[PDB]
Design a protein around this ligand. Structure first.
Ligand SMILES: [Ca+2]
Length: 127
């Protein structure tokens, strides 16, 4: 994993995730990001490799199982996805790609209904 956060002691992301609420003990381990609304990150292309395929992964859950999440990734393409959390934590994965090492950013957005929980968000290189 290139970038990782556990919403506890570890976060090596080069930019901040917005709207992070970790005052809970509902994580896969420790604390989770309790998502109410949107959490977004802009990662400069200076902090990523060019012409690379990546996977944005993580774990989500909704104990009341009545909510869903839109994942939007703005990279080479601008693709949106539909994520339905289960009652307990399960892993999600979404591929995206980079092009040139310009001064643009790739953008990762998670937008949920109600209250959902996110933990151990990673960005990993593939090929
Ligand atoms: Ca955690």
């Amino acid at each position: 994993p290139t970038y990782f956060t556990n919403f506890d002691d570890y976060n090596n992301y080069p930019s901040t995730w917005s709207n992070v609420n970790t005052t809970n003990q509902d994580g896969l381990q420790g604390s989770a990001n309790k998502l109410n609304g949107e959490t977004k990150i802009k990662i400069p292309m200076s902090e990523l490799k060019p012409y690379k395929r990546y996977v944005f992964s993580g774990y989500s859950k909704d104990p009341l199982t009545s909510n869903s999440i839109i994942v939007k990734i703005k990279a080479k393409e601008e693709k949106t996805d539909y994520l339905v959390p289960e009652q307990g934590y399960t892993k999600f994965s979404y591929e995206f790609e980079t092009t040139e090492k310009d001064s643009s950013n790739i953008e990762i957005t998670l937008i949920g209904s109600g209250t959902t929980y996110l933990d151990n968000l990673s960005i990993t290189e593939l090929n």
